[PDB]
Amino acid sequence: MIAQGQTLPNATLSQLTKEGMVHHPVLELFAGKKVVLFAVPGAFTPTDSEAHLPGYIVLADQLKAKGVDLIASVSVNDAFVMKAWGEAQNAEEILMLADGDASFTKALGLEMDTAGFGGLRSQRYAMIIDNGVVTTLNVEAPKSFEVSNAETILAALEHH
Amino acid sequence: MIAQGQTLPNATLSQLMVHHPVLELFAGKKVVLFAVPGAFTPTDSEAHLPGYIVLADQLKAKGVDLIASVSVNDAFVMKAWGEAQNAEEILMLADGDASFTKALGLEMDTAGFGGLRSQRYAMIIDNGVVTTLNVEAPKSFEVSNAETILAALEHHHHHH
């Protein structure tokens, strides 16, 4: 499992935009920025759609007011599902990133097996990333949602 | 791999949360089952699935009792996709870990898009017996569409 102080693996995350499908090198996309990245087990699922992602939508402005250049959600879903999920959630201020084959998630050691529900998915977590180095890392406990929410990240940014 | 004339494997498909066993779901019925590589993808959302929604009543008129769609997605995405598509007449089935698809030998590796997804195909299943199996060639869409399946049922209405 990745830990605070490590650089992100040289992995790719996909996004569907106007020019079309783009494969972002993570170490390029997050270079030189303060990034809040949070992961959900799957788009259109209850906790992610009713609590986790909405929490970051409502606090997006206050997060960026404390120096956050980029807020991004990642899930083990394809980019077409991620785009439709963000439009249904009005997540225009959140960068919706797809880890279709769970390769980025596997490289972080943060995968989990949902068996017949959805195969391999991401654990629920949230990170603060400064120029590619993981500065803070909040990984949820199984079946728990208390440390990866936007309010907890908001308090972490206030610290120093 | 499944072949024309065999029964289906004793697998389950999920719907929103019941785990339909396919040997019991399709028993005593003439079933049209078609598979897509993924919910919310362009071909599946703009051509394949809408083709069966439109021709649904015509298919039922030609003797099919049940029209089902299956994809390697979880049931929450499949339900959200069916509602966005207005597919109340279609039974949207989820094979979230590709177990049903791999049992048929019809899985394909989409790599980073991605993960294991289903090949595009269409089946006519008459009391558990796959009597027509139209598996597309790579990147092809000309044997699994609703019109082809409707055509394969016409000879049942001419008693030679």
Residue numbers in the entry:
A (entry chain B): 1 to 160
B (entry chain A): 1 to 16, 21 to 164
Extract from the study:
To examine the interactions between VvPrx3 and peroxides, the H2O2-bound Prx3 (C48D/C73S) structure was determined at 1.9 Å resolution. A high concentration (500 µM) of H2O2 was incubated with crystals of reduced Prx3 (C48D/C73S), which changed the space group and unit-cell parameters. The H2O2 binding site is fully accessible from the solvent since it is exposed to the external medium. The structure is analogous to that of the H2O2-bound archaeal 2-Cys Prx thio­redoxin peroxidase from Aeropyrum pernix K1, in which the corresponding cysteine residue was overoxidized and shares the H2O2 binding site. Thus, it is likely that substrate binding near CP is important in the rapid catalysis of VvPrx3. In Prx structures only one O atom of H2O2 near Cys48 (or Asp48 in our structure) makes further interactions with VvPrx3, while the other O atom makess no interaction with H2O2-bound Prx3 (C48D/C73S).
